[PDB]
């Protein structure tokens, strides 16, 4: 486990040397993703049954 605790160190050497961001920037960014793409998400913005295969679509190419 000696040569092995060495791995765990030089691996945390990695994890800690990243360039981070502020949680507030991180959350705003998501929050604008959802906003920008909600028109498209059918589970939020219904489509005509005309087009919904699990409701009233009839033709399928």
């Amino acid at each position: 486990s000696i040569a092995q605790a060495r791995k765990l160190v030089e691996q945390l050497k990695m994890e800690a040397n990243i360039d981070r961001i502020k949680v507030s920037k991180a959350a705003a960014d998501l929050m604008a993703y959802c906003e920008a793409h909600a028109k498209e998400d059918p589970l939020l913005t219904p489509v005509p049954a005309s087009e919904n295969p699990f409701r009233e679509k009839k033709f399928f190419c």
Binding site: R6, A16, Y33, H37, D41
Partner: protein, 339 residues
């Protein structure tokens, strides 16, 4: 000794991590989202019940056309279905009864599964000679296949109870890249959209983020107090979710390098088994060992809806690429689609 002159160094680097993060933590998503309208009531209804397996379903996966979907089961059989009609496309008797996962190559051409044979079997579905035959068996893992996902017809990533993942070159049949780090059975994984990274979650209650191309682990997120059963990337690839035996989900962010949110209730006590996002990422779907499947406001952490339909554990589940619909699998043996 020399081991405690390094285990104490492990404690002083963990803390420089616990530092950079608490310094990033100016606000919380639940505060930044406090202003936007709640999502409203999500009362989706079962639209197709897929009947065919003779016992528990353990995994399932949409093909990129949001019409076809593979499932695997205790009945040693693999079904592929065609959700629009309910017809079976292929029933695939397996070599091993003990399957646990399955997967659909994006191209359509192959599917893959494995289980306690410790093998990841690729199947050809457009065999030159109009047939469905095994076309590769990927041996190398020293534990059970727990998940897998193709990157194209020639590459696939697997996660194993041996505590490792790997990327395969299917022609070569050998691990082109290995992923050590986890200290317990790897249980799920999600490739991200760039398919340049991928995240794994495991029984060490940690999720890890891996560079496909390089082979190294970049970031390790913790917080759950129990096995992480499932995991899903948010659609923009800068964040991801998990599900655990601790009865919660959480969403993590990669650039903030820490946990953003927690979804839970004081009433929900059994563990999550699966998770996945709606096309915008605004909703987080989550299966539960209590036969239910909860729909959450990913951004406000309120429970938007419930899909009550199975008479047993919801083993698995999964939203369509075009967002049209949600499949769920369960121990009761039936898959159900909802809209």
């Amino acid at each position: 000794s020399e081991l405690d002159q390094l285990r104490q160094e492990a404690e002083q680097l963990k803390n420089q991590i616990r530092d950079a993060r608490k310094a990033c933590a100016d606000a919380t998503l639940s505060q930044i989202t406090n202003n936007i309208d709640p999502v409203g009531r999500i009362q989706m209804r079962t639209r197709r019940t897929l009947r065919g397996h003779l016992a528990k379903i353990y995994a399932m996966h949409w093909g990129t056309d949001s019409r076809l979907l593979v499932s695997a089961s205790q009945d040693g059989k693999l079904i592929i279905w065609d959700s629009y009609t309910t017809n079976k496309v292929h029933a695939i008797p397996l070599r091993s009864s003990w399957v646990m996962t399955c997967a659909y190559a994006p191209s359509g051409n192959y599917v893959a599964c494995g289980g306690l044979d410790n093998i990841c079997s690729i199947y050809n579905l457009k065999t030159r000679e109009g047939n469905v035959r095994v076309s590769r068996e990927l041996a190398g893992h020293t534990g059970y296949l727990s998940c897998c996902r193709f990157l194209d017809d020639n590459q696939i990533v697997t996660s194993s109870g041996d505590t490792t993942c790997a990327l395969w070159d299917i022609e070569t049949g050998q691990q082109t890249t290995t992923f050590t780090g986890h200290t317990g059975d790897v249980m799920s994984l999600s490739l991200a959209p760039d398919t340049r990274l991928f995240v794994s979650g495991a029984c060490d209650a940690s999720a890890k983020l891996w560079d496909v191309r390089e082979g190294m682990c970049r970031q390790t997120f913790t917080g759950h107090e129990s096995d992480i059963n499932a995991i899903c990337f948010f659609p923009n690839g800068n964040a991801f979710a998990t599900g655990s035996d601790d009865a919660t989900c959480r969403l993590f962010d990669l650039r903030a390098d820490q946990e953003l949110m927690t979804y839970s209730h004081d009433n929900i006590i059994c563990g999550i088994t699966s998770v996945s996002f709606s096309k915008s990422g605004r909703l987080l779907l989550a299966g539960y060992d209590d036969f239910n499947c909860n729909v959450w406001d990913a951004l406000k952490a309120d429970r938007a809806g419930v899909l009550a339909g199975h008479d047993n554990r919801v083993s698995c589940l999964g939203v369509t690429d075009d967002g049209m619909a949600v499949a769920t699998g369960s121990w009761d043996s039936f898959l159900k689609i909802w809209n």
